[PDB]
Symmetry: D3
Subunit: 298 residues, 6 copies
Amino acid sequence: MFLRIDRLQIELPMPKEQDPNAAAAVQALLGGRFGEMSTLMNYMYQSFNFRGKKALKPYYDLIANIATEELGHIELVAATINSLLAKNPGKDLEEGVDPESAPLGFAKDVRNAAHFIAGGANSLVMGAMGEHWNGEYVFTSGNLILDLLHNFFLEVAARTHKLRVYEMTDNPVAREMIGYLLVRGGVHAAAYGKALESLTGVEMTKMLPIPKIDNSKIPEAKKYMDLGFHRNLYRFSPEDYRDLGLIWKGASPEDGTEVVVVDGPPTGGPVFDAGHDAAEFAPEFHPGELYEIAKKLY
Amino acid sequence: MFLRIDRLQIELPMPKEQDPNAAAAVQALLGGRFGEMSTLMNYMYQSFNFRGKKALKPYYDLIANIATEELGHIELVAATINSLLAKNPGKDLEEGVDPESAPLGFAKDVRNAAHFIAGGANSLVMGAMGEHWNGEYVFTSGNLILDLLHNFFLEVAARTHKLRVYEMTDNPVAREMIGYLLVRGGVHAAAYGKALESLTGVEMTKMLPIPKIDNSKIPEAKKYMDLGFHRNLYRFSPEDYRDLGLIWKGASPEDGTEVVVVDGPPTGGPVFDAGHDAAEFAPEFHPGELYEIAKKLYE
Amino acid sequence: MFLRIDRLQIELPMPKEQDPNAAAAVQALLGGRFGEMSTLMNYMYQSFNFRGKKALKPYYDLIANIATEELGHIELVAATINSLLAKNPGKDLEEGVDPESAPLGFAKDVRNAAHFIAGGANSLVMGAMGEHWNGEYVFTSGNLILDLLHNFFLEVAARTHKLRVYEMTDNPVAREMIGYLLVRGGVHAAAYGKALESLTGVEMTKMLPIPKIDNSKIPEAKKYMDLGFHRNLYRFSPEDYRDLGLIWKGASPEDGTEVVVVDGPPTGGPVFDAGHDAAEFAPEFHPGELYEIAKKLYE
Amino acid sequence: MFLRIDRLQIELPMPKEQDPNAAAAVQALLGGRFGEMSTLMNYMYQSFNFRGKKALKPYYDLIANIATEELGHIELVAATINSLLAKNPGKDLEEGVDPESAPLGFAKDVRNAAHFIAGGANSLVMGAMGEHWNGEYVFTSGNLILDLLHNFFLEVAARTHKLRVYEMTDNPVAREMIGYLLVRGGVHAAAYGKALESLTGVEMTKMLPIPKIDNSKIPEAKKYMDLGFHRNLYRFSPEDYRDLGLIWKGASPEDGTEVVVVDGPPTGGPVFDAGHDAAEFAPEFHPGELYEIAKKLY
Amino acid sequence: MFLRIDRLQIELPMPKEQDPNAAAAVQALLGGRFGEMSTLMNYMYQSFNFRGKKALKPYYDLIANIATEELGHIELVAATINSLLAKNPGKDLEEGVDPESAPLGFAKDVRNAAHFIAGGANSLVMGAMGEHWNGEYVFTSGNLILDLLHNFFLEVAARTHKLRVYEMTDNPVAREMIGYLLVRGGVHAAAYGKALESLTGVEMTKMLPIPKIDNSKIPEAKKYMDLGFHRNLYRFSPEDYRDLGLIWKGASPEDGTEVVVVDGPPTGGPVFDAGHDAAEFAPEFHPGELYEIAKKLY
Amino acid sequence: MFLRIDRLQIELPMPKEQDPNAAAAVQALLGGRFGEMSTLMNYMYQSFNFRGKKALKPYYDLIANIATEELGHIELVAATINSLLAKNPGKDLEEGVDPESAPLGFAKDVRNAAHFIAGGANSLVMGAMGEHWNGEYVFTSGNLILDLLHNFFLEVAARTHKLRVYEMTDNPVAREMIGYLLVRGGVHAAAYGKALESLTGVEMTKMLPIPKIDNSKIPEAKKYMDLGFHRNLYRFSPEDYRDLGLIWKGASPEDGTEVVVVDGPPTGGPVFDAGHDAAEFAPEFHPGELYEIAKKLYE
């Protein structure tokens, strides 16, 4: 079972302008083959299908726990996309919008028109080409080492895509999210690397970084490393998966410092609210009436 | 953010033997268009994309919270499928399996061979025809009423599929899961129905049940309702979504009794471990050595 | 625009019992790449996209008209599949069905479980492997000769699939539909062949039949040819497409006899009603009440 | 069985210029998840699979009939797309086009290149992202009420997409089509709503409009409502489905006026002919010879 | 079994600038429904599934051989796409690239962002809309005549797409490739046409050209015809498929001249190397170290 | 460019009879995500997209060359599937087949009906669930180490699928192909492992085998290793890729013996001809006339 905390894993800067194509690119990091939806569903199903949940407990704890962090990862990337697509972030009401004026005219020429037709100027479960995320992006073989090897590759491939998208947009919201998830993804790659080292004797972490560029060279990532977040494997559980430290220990591939397990989730930041977008009829063409109904419920 | 509890939403019975085709059918309830992956992802993304999270908080609380319960739903259906595919449930080691003997011969003729090739005799993110779940099964328009209407339909369609699969498999593991999720799905349909009633004045809950057959006619579902589960909307959060009672109140479509918000998750049951299946090399052909490595980690 | 007549293109016999796998195979002839959905959508879109609707009218008439017949083709194949899936064809009500008895147990082991889960034991827009029909099965280039060449190939490929399915299912409902559509498909291939002959001078009809087996060897098809159906190109329109005879003339590839344009649609047969299937909750678990509501509508 | 009338459901204005991206957006209304292909195929298959065709005749008449109108809907949207992609609308011949000059250069940068590569600058069976329409967009459960509930939702979702596309392009051809289909779609939503009301007692039509904006506020839609088209449910059949009036009666959700069944199809307008586009080799690079062959057939 | 020669089927001009959208369009000729991947896989599988490999040897030789040439066709189109996406063609190292500067900013607005996210600014197995090539684009019925008819259509449809893409970009690399493959594709269409003529008596080659425009009117294609390449059916095999001449003989649909079988593959040209693209971390962020490792291996 | 030799990479035994479901399972090894189509296309495109073809030649040689061997791999698996689907292997003509007798009746109930409808009882570009192979199964990042890591994983995952299918089908044709490709796949994994060791210092080959079961335990694979095939990296080129030995050297993960580069392709075995299947109209309903036409071509 799962519980939810109404907070993003980190505080994101408020968007200052809509950037459709930046959002379209960031989608690759959400619903693309190596987006957070894939890291999420791969570990989630592997955790469900895990054989030897007690006999190989440290490894089960690891996959089950990281799968839980991934839920926060898709949430964070979705909030980033929504920030890039929000017309009036944080504003509950905008009046005077008239469909006849073609208020969505700009969307006719952007890469991703779905964001404005299927979505109400919001995130969708797809990649940078509009391809919807699909279950075949998941690998759950039941063989522990094979799955771990897949996961190590999965994380470094995912990192590569984040670095490339980072180079496509200088948008502060997108780069803040990328900087943080580069660090978190790096922790996961290191964790699976350590898991493989313990089971096979092969020094997988010595292969890092892939590509051969350090996260320390990415300002937004360095910011979080300076706070020590590359050393933390958060235990996203009230009382379970307490044996993470048996694998998550030793040197960090980033700077060689000792890594540690942090019981409980990160502090986090507030959730994001794109506000009212009348042209998208979201949450309603004119939500005044609905806001009154909600008020009366109290 | 989210937290995880290593417990299934309910305790599942143990299967007498493997039933591949039963597992193949149950997949429709996991990765199919109206499977739990769809209810999960629809509410999850709608919650992310929700506009007016504070101004329309009662409704946001509802979608955000139910989305969290859906995580337990996919987990439960996956556990059911894994139970149906497990050769030695609860057994850590089986020795003597020889690939030359064609130990997976039976799998050559079952409906879903992927369960035994791509999966190590375990669940996959797909439906009853092998179709992988996809993001287009998600509807997130940004318009509250439109999304709620979609969700009401989504749950009754999902219920219909569970009823049909219930009639295909007599397996107690499958029927226990279905009985429970019929009740939970009913709570969600009722919740979205009440939300629509408050926003539009249209008495959506009076349309229930759909199809026109009561959950009380399904033995397993009836038991869970006798335990009062049709009245419960669990607040799956440490401190958030505390306004669920503003919408989740009034009569239950099942028996007209007063519904209630339950603080926190239910106790549930233990997670499932399919055990060792050497032919599937899961968790390893012979996990003896890996088990020793694990033991040594504890020093 | 279009109009509808509540009649199948031909009368279909009634099945002795359900045959799920026969229905699964026949789906290839509906939603598969070369199923009737493909001939329908290819000609339908080509007709919409046709350039020179007046300057090349004889050819536009042909594609626009055949596209209309294709609507009857998907309807007929769907009716065949529904017949094979019907538990109580022609019966409005069956009482006593209890989900607890696992009334759909047999469906757990058939090839296509979707027919019983997503569908209420009815046709779906897919092929023989559960693959849903998709728009990329359509070719609409805007170039007349290229489209016509594609269409000629499309029909003979479609014929090949029908012949193969004919050899898989001995069911009279399936074979009656196939015998008829082999003849109709043959008329279309002949028509596109004649169109190509007029535009390029290449004697495409002399390549027929493909495969090299005559429709006369298929009993059901032979009967329809004995009724003269291989000579008929029906003008499925009240007043339009009156120039079909400019291309649809001359010898039939089947027997060398003069082909003819028939004014209007054939009489056909009655539509099919699968009846009540309580286990599938179709049209309702127990439709008694709904039937009363319907009766009351007439006052 | 079916018959065809060589007319669009309504007369469309002639396009004055090519607008590729407008056409790309309008595709969402044709081959997208909630495009006319979906309303068409959903009702068409439901009508085929209908159980109790006589015992529940009024409802069968309704679905079977509306499915027939939908055929005209995909035809109308396709004509709209073709109008937006036509270089020389209504002109049988253009000479002097030389491929070496790169006459399709502009298409290299438009959103939908398929329109010009796979299609001969014509409509395709896909959505706004190039996604081809697929059979999983169809819901045919065999359960009457469940199907009707799905259809009610389907129509209001489809309306929402039309409103959004309407706001993306001020193109007269696209807006004329959208205005008319907003009205027709509204009739269908109202019809399914009334069907549900008769079978369940739940006042579904009271939920309209969704989104909360009236079609009367859309000039092109208001135009057709002023002609009374929101009150008409046309019986697209020579002699069948004569019991539509048992469900289609009472007040219109638009203005509360009495709705009625109109026997026979609407008058309609002429079909559209995009003319010759040599660069697309449609209908031929130079159709002069083919035109002569056709002439001789007469 | 197969062997490989490290040469492109023809020498290609070096790209003078990156042209993302041109590359996106050319993808239709690679992974699109009628791209070289389709001609390749259709003939390849038909050759595997061929019944009567000896009893119908001339026809088997034909399909098995052309399938082999198609391998060079996907290679040539891929090299063309890579040429259009190469930042520093032929250069092993570029220094000073800093991700923080958003060096891939331009890619945020191009049609195909996948080229820069999933690919390292390189070709992908997809079409012009980002659709990945799929096995359903293959037709292998086992019936010889049906397959040959399909192949004749396949080649003329493929030609049509090449002509359309040719008209979308005046890029020299793309047009050189298109000119050559128009000629090679024409040979294949003629070959299948002749095969059909021998088996059915129907003069299929008389239907050419389709569309009704001659390759001689395309400068780049005429260039290769003047060298006589439209007359050559190369036998891509050391010692097998020696009976091609039984079908490949007689007049060429292009100019009526006698066609001939050429034993062995064409001379070809050098392979293409897109060089170092640091922003894409290809072959590495900074390959200096890897180049040294390779050097030491020698 | 490429050249073709009309020989399979190994000689395959002849099947005793058709085994449709065995063929359906083997399809996973051809068109499935980890089938030979994936190893082929991954290396093929990586070789096209390779940057630093001269500066990193040893690695380019490796990928370009193995990609060429993969062509023989898809050919071999296709031949295995065709063998399992052949009614009259090696027989040019069967007379008397009558479609009316429902000669393909058995196919109505097999897992993969597409083999008999879309295919003329022959291989298709798909997996074990009918899913068609697609380009997204290809990973070509342009980054050498990332691609090599992917390839190492790709081969061991592919091996795992072959081992599972080996346990599903006891058919000698399937097991001979699997035994051989387990060995060849092992060589490729070893090769990519050695490439990674040279570029990163990480001893990837020490992770082998995955799963933890030796190929020596599979009879058919053991035989090929006894013939020394696990040591061979064939240079599938007339004059190119002559630097394979710079990486393909040292100990074999199988037995620690010195691996070697073999100049040119192996002798292999004859290609497979499924013969005439009249019910499938392949190569023709009755090929008598076509055979005469072919004979006459030789004058």
